[PDB]
C-alpha cells in the first residue's frame, strides 16, 4: 500500500493491504527484517517521524499503531522495533478507517485523518 523511509536512508517501512507492516533494513537482507501483523484490517499508510525514532501505521480498522523504531549505525546493534501505543476510538465509515497519518517535523505529534472528516491530534 505505502512506504516510508528513515532519514538515515537505510531503513524502509512497507504498509501493505495484507494487514502487515514490513520493516526493511537495506544492509540486513533482501527479505523484510521484521514483519508485523497487529492490525486487524487492511493497512493504509505508514509514516516515519523525520527526526525522532517513532513511526505509525494507520489502517481501516480505525486503530493507529504507534511504534518506536530505534536505529544505531553500529553493525552489532540491530534496530530495536517496539510497539508504544495503540490509538483507538476512531469511527469507520464505509469500511474506511484511518486513511492517512502524518508526523510533526519536530516533536512526537500525530496527524491522523479519518473517513468521517475528523483530524485527530495524538500528542
Amino acid at each position: 500500500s505505502s512506504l516510508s523511509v528513515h532519514s538515515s536512508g537505510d531503513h524502509v517501512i512497507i504498509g501493505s493491504y495484507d494487514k502487515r507492516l514490513c520493516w526493511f533494513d537495506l544492509d540486513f537482507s533482501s527479505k523484510p527484517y521484521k514483519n508485523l501483523r497487529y492490525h486487524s484490517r487492511a493497512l493504509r499508510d505508514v509514516s516515519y517521524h523525520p527526526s525522532l525514532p517513532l513511526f505509525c501505521s494507520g489502517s481501516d480498522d480505525g486503530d493507529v499503531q504507534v511504534f518506536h523504531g530505534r536505529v544505531y549505525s553500529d553493525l552489532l546493534a540491530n534496530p530495536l522495533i517496539v510497539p508504544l501505543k495503540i490509538l483507538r476510538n476512531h469511527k469507520v465509515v464505509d469500511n474506511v478507517g484511518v486513511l492517512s497519518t502524518c508526523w510533526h517535523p519536530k516533536e512526537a505529534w500525530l496527524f491522523s485523518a479519518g473517513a468521517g472528516g475528523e483530524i485527530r491530534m495524538w500528542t
Binding site: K34, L36, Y38, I81, V82, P83, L84, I86
Partner: peptide, 25 residues
C-alpha cells in the same frame, strides 16, 4: 500501559504458536 504493551509485544521470538497454550489454559 505496561500490561497492554506486553500484550502486543508478541513480535515473534515466542517459537511457533506456543504462548497461547498457557494463556488459553
Amino acid at each position: 500501559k505496561e500490561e497492554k504493551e506486553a500484550k502486543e509485544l508478541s513480535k515473534m521470538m515466542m517459537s511457533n504458536k506456543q504462548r497461547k497454550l498457557y494463556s488459553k489454559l
